[PDB]
Amino acid sequence: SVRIREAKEGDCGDILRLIRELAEFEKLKISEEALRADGFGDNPFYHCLVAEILGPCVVGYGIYYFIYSTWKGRTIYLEDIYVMPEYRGQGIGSKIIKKVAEVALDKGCSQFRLAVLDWNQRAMDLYKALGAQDLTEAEGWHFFCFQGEATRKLAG
Amino acid sequence: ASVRIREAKEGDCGDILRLIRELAEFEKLSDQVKISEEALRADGFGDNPFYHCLVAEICVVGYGIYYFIYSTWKGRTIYLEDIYVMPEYRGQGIGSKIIKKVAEVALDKGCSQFRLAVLDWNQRAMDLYKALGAQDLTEAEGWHFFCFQGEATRKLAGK
Ligand SMILES: CC(=O)SCCNC(=O)CCNC(=O)[C@H](O)C(C)(C)COP(=O)(O)OP(=O)(O)OC[C@H]1O[C@@H](n2cnc3c(N)ncnc32)[C@H](O)[C@@H]1OP(=O)(O)O
Known about the structure:
The structure is a homodimer.
Chain A: E1 2-6, H1 12-25, H2 32-40, E2 47-53, E3 57-69, E4 73-83, H3 92-106, E5 111-117, H4 121-129, E6 133-134, H5 135-139, E7 141-147, H6 149-154
Parallel strand pairs in A: 4-5
Antiparallel strand pairs in A: 1-2, 2-3, 3-4
The complex binds acetyl coenzyme *A.
PDB class: transferase
Keywords: AAH11751, structural genomics, protein structure initiative, center for eukaryotic structural genomics, cesg, transferase
Assembly: dimeric
């Protein structure tokens, strides 16, 4: 059986390995130390869920944080979600998503957001199957990012 | 018109909501505004705020709402969630002043990643952002914005 649960500091090694797997899957600077500090700190920057087979082994994860919508208020953003290849298509990713929804309601967040690459149609299809809307396709939203000098020029 | 851009205070939340509702009403989407003044107060002005807000003041005539995010690709990032200026005050550079200020906040915190979403009708904005060195990630990289809205979320959570 599989359980989705809050990460503990002891999971940081396993989580770092899985972050590296998802980064490679997506085709492109965090230490185990940074994870422990940022993900559990005071003051945590983000929150991690692990999928664990019941010794027990961690086979997937999600990372989310709290954001905001001006129409709806408190919102969660699901940043990373990943299940190891051997463990895909046995409901684990859907269970991680359901857990994020449960956490959302528990924390007074009516809705949750994510970003996904348009080549990743199997993921997009799952999110649509679970009730999500593609607002890029529906409304025309384009993500922009300024880095380094671009942000400096933006700041005039 | 003479305008200042300043940090919002808890007492500006009535005005922020009035502006959000004015936009929604303009778009014929009034029924979609579920946020409350009490939420803007609680979510913005307690110990761990969900957002930060700059207002444009002559009468508050505009706002920019942002928050920080942690991207597993680039680390700490500022994300501009929304900028609105009342139509009567459009053409006066107020929106440009707000975005400039948000960019300065990022830099002041020692963060140089800035992210936002822009609607595709807004060619003026898109052209300027590219000219400044920004990348359109949707066009460049195929990023799509997904949202599990209220009904979908409740269903997933087993209601
Ligand atoms: C928000 C951002 O992080 S988007 C990034 C999403 N992450 C990835 O694409 C990493 C690689 N893939 C995975 O981690 C997983 O396959 C996930 C998270 C996408 C889906 O989780 P799983 O446990 O495999 O899926 P689950 O069993 O809950 O089933 C749903 C669907 O997954 C999708 N899927 C993606 N890859 C597979 C796969 N290898 N095998 C079976 N289904 C897959 C399909 O849409 C399937 O739908 P269907 O049953 O109607 O045919």
